[PDB]
Design a protein around this nucleic acid. Structure first.
Ligand code: FDA
Length: 458
DNA sequence: ATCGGCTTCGCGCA
DNA sequence: TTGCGCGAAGCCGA
């Protein structure tokens, strides 16, 4: 019943007579998960129960309370949802390449399954796991509508090369999800969420008046809330998306990106629901292009350039152009600290930084601006990269994500873009100006909203 | 082929 | 505001 182009064999072996174990990692939800649906099947095709394992890692120390609380409040709800269908969830603390490896032994796992990520480190882990299990090891793309290694086989130069590949594959791969069959047969998150927050408090972004910057109430975490954010977008916001998606003063975005990043909702379900929805076709076309083409070319990009977060993976015309302007006199140079605390000369730029700092989700359009100004106002393209990756990943609820590196790459280095008119400092890299912003939206509204923060933020 | 078209440009202009 | 034509620009893919 499940399309088998979704499964890839990591380590062929003989099946053990124990349970099927889903090493969960990317797709932290219970519904609409091909990898957990696939685990139920081969557990049922062998009469063993299915179980799920998650592994907390030391990565959360590289970002903030905001995301750790987002993720873990998701797991507390997941965990209950899984128990309801009799599927135990066990949570591990440490390096997967050792902990998953042990778990597979201590539990006599018959077969191992994991969801798919393109980030370098998940493959580092897969290979320590492969190297230490005797059972078989299976990988299922639960994140993409069309499995990343099937849509294309090379790096897609631009979205217009990639778009027909994927759409010709859609009619075979866009299906409804079966329901999750309950089966028949470590630590507690409570303490895990407390130790982490006690460890992350020293970094928690505060204002001069001691209070935190972050506003936790713009995005309730979990599978439930995410489903409600999709249903709402589809009824109130999808008709307006094409027209109003570049207005930072509206709130016409879907606001799914923090759910999708953590897999708290399946992008395949959004597609299904949008397709079936009767709205302005131009909005459905413009929205599907984001959640389909751009989301998955971002996976295609990471999976095929391991240097995804470095200057080297820029296309050639862009490396040479930026090189030629390495010795240009930047108008302004800021340090990482100065960007962070919104101390530029450009009250629009600082505004988008206040929106990132306090909410954890910067508007789609401003994110572009945000990034191209860092290039202009740093001493080199490598610092621009570094500052951009650092701030994005540390402050976006949807950061540490393929969409993130591929998005910066587009802004700073023209991955998936094209060559525009040569400029000093920024080369042939597409330019964006404050007056360019002015004909698109009421700049001073934006500026006005977050003006009150910068005075207070230290 | 080899020429047309390319996410989300800026800017004059009506 | 908002829609259009133009400008500078490298490259894939039918
Ligand atoms: C400098 C910079 C940095 C980043 C990003 C872009 C830029 C220019 N992006 C991509 C994009 O800015 C971001 O995904 C949206 O703001 C997500 O918000 P909504 O769900 O509200 O988008 P919206 O409703 O407009 O679109 C819905 C979905 O489309 C996808 N999408 C939209 N724009 C995209 C883009 N340009 N590239 C890839 N996928 C895109 C996302 O999956 C998003 O969930 C990204 N994305 C992300 O999830 N995490 C990140 O940390 C970053 N980092």
């Amino acid at each position: 019943i499940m399309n088998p182009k979704r499964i890839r064999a990591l380590k062929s072996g003989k099946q053990g007579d124990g349970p099927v174990v889903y090493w969960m990692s990317r797709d932290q939800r219970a519904e609409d998960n091909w990898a957990l649906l696939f685990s139920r099947a081969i557990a049922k095709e062998a009469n063993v129960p299915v179980v799920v394992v998650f592994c907390l890692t030391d990565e959360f120390l590289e970002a903030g309370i905001r995301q750790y609380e987002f993720m873990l409040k998701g797991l507390q709800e997941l965990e209950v949802s899984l128990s309801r269908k009799k599927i135990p969830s066990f949570f591990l603390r440490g390096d997967p390449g050792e902990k998953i490896s042990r778990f597979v032994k201590d539990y006599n796992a018959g077969t191992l399954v994991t969801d798919f990520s393109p980030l370098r480190i998940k493959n580092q882990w897969i290979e320590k796991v492969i190297s230490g299990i005797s059972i078989p090891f299976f990988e299922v793309d639960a994140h993409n509508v069309v499995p990343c290694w099937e849509a294309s086989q090379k790096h897609e130069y631009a979205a217009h090369t990639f778009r027909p590949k994927l759409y010709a594959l859609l009619p075979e791969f866009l299906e409804e999800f079966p329901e999750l069959e309950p089966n028949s047969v470590v630590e507690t998150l409570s303490d895990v969420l407390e130790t982490g927050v006690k460890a992350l408090l020293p970094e928690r972004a505060l204002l001069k008046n001691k209070d935190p910057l972050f506003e936790p109430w713009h995005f309730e975490p979990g599978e439930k809330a995410a489903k409600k954010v999709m249903e709402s977008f589809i009824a109130d916001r999808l008709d307006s998306y094409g027209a109003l998606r570049n207005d930072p003063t509206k709130n016409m975005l879907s606001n799914l990106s923090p759910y999708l990043h953590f897999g708290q909702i399946s992008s395949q379900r959004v597609v299904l629901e949008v397709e079936k929805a009767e709205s302005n076709p131009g909005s459905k076309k413009a929205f599907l292009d984001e959640i389909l083409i751009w989301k998955e070319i971002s996976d295609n990009f990471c999976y095929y350039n391991p240097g995804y977060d470095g200057f080297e993976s820029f296309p050639s015309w862009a490396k040479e152009s930026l090189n030629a302007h390495r010795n240009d006199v930047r108008s302004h140079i800021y340090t990482l600290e100065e960007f962070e605390a919104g101390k530029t000369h450009d009250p629009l730029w600082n505004a988008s930084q206040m929106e990132l700092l306090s909410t954890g989700k910067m508007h789609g359009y401003m994110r572009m601006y945000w990034a191209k100004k860092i290039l202009e106002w740093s001493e080199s393209p490598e610092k621009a990269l570094e500052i951009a990756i650092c701030l994005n990943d540390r402050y976006e609820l949807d950061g540490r994500d393929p969409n993130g590196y591929a998005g910066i790459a587009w802004s700073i280095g023209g991955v998936h873009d094209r060559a525009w008119g040569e400029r000093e400092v920024t080369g042939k890299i597409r330019y964006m100006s404050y007056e360019g912003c002015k004909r698109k939206f009421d700049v001073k509204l934006y500026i006005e909203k977050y003006s009150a923060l910068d005075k207070l933020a230290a």
